[PDB]
Structures are given as structure tokens and as C-alpha cells.
Design a protein around this ligand. Sequence first.
Ligand SMILES: OC[C@H]1CNC[C@@H](O)[C@@H]1O[C@@H]1O[C@H](CO)[C@@H](O)[C@H](O)[C@H]1O
Ligand SMILES: OC[C@H]1CNC[C@@H](O)[C@@H]1O[C@@H]1O[C@H](CO)[C@@H](O)[C@H](O)[C@H]1O
Ligand SMILES: [Ca+2]
Ligand SMILES: [Zn+2]
Length: 528
Amino acid sequence: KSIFYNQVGYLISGDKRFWIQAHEPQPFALRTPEGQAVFAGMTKPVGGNWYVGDFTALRVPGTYTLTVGTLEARVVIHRRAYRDVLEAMLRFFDYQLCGVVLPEDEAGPWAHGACHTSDAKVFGTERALACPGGWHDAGDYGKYTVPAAKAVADLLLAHEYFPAALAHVRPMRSVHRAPHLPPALEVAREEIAWLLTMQDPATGGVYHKVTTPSFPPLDTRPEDDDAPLVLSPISYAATATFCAAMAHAALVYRPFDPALSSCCADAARRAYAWLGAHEMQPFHNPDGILTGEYGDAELRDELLWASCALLRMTGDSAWARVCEPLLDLDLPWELGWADVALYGVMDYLRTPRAAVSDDVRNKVKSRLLRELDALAAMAESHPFGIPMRDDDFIWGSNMVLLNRAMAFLLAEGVGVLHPAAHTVAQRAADYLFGANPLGQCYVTGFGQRPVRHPHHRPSVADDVDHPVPGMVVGGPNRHLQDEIARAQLAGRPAMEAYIDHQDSYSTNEVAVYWNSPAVFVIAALLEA
Ligand SMILES: OC[C@H]1CNC[C@@H](O)[C@@H]1O[C@@H]1O[C@H](CO)[C@@H](O)[C@H](O)[C@H]1O
Ligand SMILES: OC[C@H]1CNC[C@@H](O)[C@@H]1O[C@@H]1O[C@H](CO)[C@@H](O)[C@H](O)[C@H]1O
Ligand SMILES: [Ca+2]
Ligand SMILES: [Zn+2]
């Protein structure tokens, strides 16, 4: 029996809330560290056992003691409460670096030598290839094209939308090339550079992944993983998500790295030439390969994103001939990793009005507004005010929640101003930081109940005790898709289907595409 609140803190000019399981409204106070009362209010019902306490009006920064009943919590008010967590969430990408020496001056206890240096065999051939750099996908050391495209798309979007907030954070600056680009672009260049090695120079097709034939033991240090590396076959999705992320990078890097920008635009075109010459065939793990499949039977949403990305890159009206029919389909307007349509929607809507049908544009703008209203309706009925239903608590539910928060924020930039946008973003950060039924801070190294045992090979393998900070875990998953979850979590409601245990990969794994929308959301809150 306790207080559920944002364990990282609150913004001076932002919404401040706490939750408790109660039966009636209770008086509550916020005190200074000495004990003097500064704010007083009454709790109020929100659904079931849930009562809220809103202390938004308390604008004087500081470390306050919140008291309700006999319970006590330590809360923090600061003009930049989330800067530290944002910096850590952005440094996670530098911790995930493959084939790069991470020095102790930058990485501290989690420093290591260059891992996965050896070349990879192209599956079913004797041909080898060097595909170095990039990020280890998650808790495993695999490098997967499809989810990598989402991680890049998100960081580029965060820099485009919130560069002022991102300017206050510092990545592992000493491992990147000089002159130093803005923080998010410096971190994302590494993954973009790697992604280019994945494209077949012969055809323009992109390899789905570069992984060892199977998952090594959970206790493997990055440099001790020495099984042969295999390039899984070229896939439609890998190629289409690559084209999309590459054209986006071409626009963003134009004033910062013109050579990379040019290199990315040509790589996107060749990848689009591959799409029109090939069939929409889903990927399936070939015999022997037992690593993450990242499969998807629906590939029109990837074509939509790759077309719209090139439409925004070129600014050519000719591309709308291909976008506009795809924009008419009943595809889920989502932010990945498998349903990517919203990225295409965004790219289309952020293209000059002259190159698009003003009527298709309005229909697209209207669908998005209805989509936001549906997310807003869910948040209005959820006691934590998050656009979530019990059935949305799936594998990587924190990404579902963050992508939804991110959907509201992206829309603010294409004239779709929902009155719920900022509340939803605040509630999503509160949830992530401990305002959930488990009182769990879903980020490592932060809050009073941080994640101590994630499914992360460098954090399990090392003898440090504390895991790498700034890692966002998948979160509660009702399907119980691992032995530890099947064992400990049967019968538990959707939001409580989480376990802080290293073997629970379905609720406790970390990932590059789970940290990326967190970076967007946190930067949005700081900026506004
Ligand atoms: O479900 C597949 C994996 C999700 N990403 C990283 C992997 O570590 C997860 O996989 C499995 O790793 C296990 C945990 O040690 C090992 O037990 C298994 O034999 C793999 O399925
Ligand atoms: O758990 C994060 C990923 C670690 N590397 C291997 C991938 O299989 C893991 O991914 C997720 O895989 C799941 C199994 O197909 C899919 O259910 C999830 O939506 C992915 O996050
Ligand atoms: Ca898809
Ligand atoms: Zn590596």
C-alpha cells in the first residue's frame, strides 16, 4: 500500500499528479524537506480503487514530501526535471554500439572493446561482407534492419521537432567523429552508416539482418560472442523501411553532412528501384537462423512510408500518384516496428501543399483527427490517463504507449492540434516513471523503483550489479510469452503482467526502438 507517482520528477510549468488506491477522497499535503506545508488538496475518484491528487499549481521548484493518509513520498519539482533521464536514454544508443571501442572515460563500468569485428557470410552463398557498426538491437547482439529504421526515424523526428531540448544533453561525444553534430544526429549517424553496408550493391536490395545463427548465452560479454555472423536474405520490408529511413536522413543531414545526405538519397532511390522489381514477400527465418525474425505479412504500409519519404525528400508531385492511393487503404496508422503507415502519413503531410491533392490532404488530416479522438477516449477512461486498453498490454507495451503519446505530438506540426496532446505526453512519462499499478519505474538507473535486472547481455555478463542506465524495458505483457512470466504472472491483470527478472525477455528486455519514442516524448515535454 503506497503512493504511485512520477519518481523522476515534475516540471515547474507542467501537470503534477499522484495516484493511490483508496475508497473515499482524502486530504493531502506537499511539504518542504523541513516539513512546512506548501500545497493542500483533496483526492478524487478516477476509476475503481484509483484516486488522484493534482498539485499542478505548486510552481516553486524543490524536493517536496507528499503526504496522503499515513503514506509518504519524496517528489521533485525542477524547470528541467527530465534532462538527466533524456541524456541517459540517448546514451543507451552509444552503449549499444557494435565494433566500436567504448572507453571507461565515456562508458564507465560498462566499457568494452570492439565486438563483432569479423565479416558475415551471405546466407546460402560463400560470399562474405563487412557490415560493421550500428547498434545491438536489444538484449541480444543482433543487428536488424526493420526495427533499426524506426529507431533512426524517431531520433531524426526528435531533432526536427525539439532541437532546443536535445541541445542540453550530451552523448558519448568522444566516440563519434568531429566536428560534432547536434546530439540526436551524432547518435543516429552510426546506425545510418551501418544501414548503408546492408544494401546489396548488385541489386539495391537490403539484407533483413546480420546475426550469429542463434542466441548466445545470457551471460555473454559483447567481445566474447564469437560465433560466425550471417547476413539473412534480402527482404521486401528491410528494403522498404531502409528506403524510408534513408530519404528522411537525406533531408535532415543536408545542412550538417552533405556527403552522407547525398549517399543516403541515392541509397534510397536504388532501394526503391528494388521494390518495384520484386514481390511483397514476408521474411521467414531460414534454416539454422534462430534469432529475432521481425516478420510482417502486411507490406503496403512500408511501401507507403518509402513513397512518402521520397515524396518529402524530392518534393516532386509525381510521387503523390503512388502515395495517395496507399493513403486511401484501411492500414493501421501506427508507428512501427511492423505497422509504419503513420510515418508515411507524417511525411506526406509535411510535404509542400503544391505537390499534393489539397482534397486527399484534408481527408488524411481528418482521419488522423478521428484516430487521435479514439486514443483520447481511451485515456479519458483509463485511471492513469494513458491511451491504453487491457488488450494493448502486449510485448513491448511501453512502445505501444510511447508511440501513441508520440502520435499526438507529431500532429501538432501538421495543423492537427488535439487539446489532449500534452496531458497524454505527461501521463505517458508519469506511467514510465512509476505511475502504474506496480509502482515500477520502467527505465534502468532512475526513480525509487528502477529496473535492476533487465534481459540485457552486457548487464547480465558483467559483474557490476547495476545495469546500464537509461534503458526502457518492454513492460507488462498479458500473453506471458516466456517461462518466468508463465510461472510468476498467470492470473495477473494486464498492467501487472511485468516481472523485473533477467530471463523474462517478453516483459523485461530493452531495445533501440523502445528508447527512441521515449527520447521523442521526453524531449517534447521539456521543449513545451
Ligand atoms: O525470444 C527471443 C529473444 C528476444 N531477444 C533476445 C533473446 O535473448 C530472447 O531469447 C532467447 O534467449 C534466451 C534467454 O537467455 C535463451 O534462453 C533462448 O534459448 C532464446 O530463445
Ligand atoms: O524483445 C526485443 C527483441 C530482441 N531481439 C530479437 C527480437 O525477436 C525481439 O523482439 C520482439 O520480437 C517479438 C517476437 O517475434 C515481437 O513480438 C516483438 O513485437 C518485438 O519487439
Ligand atoms: Ca507492415
Ligand atoms: Zn557487437
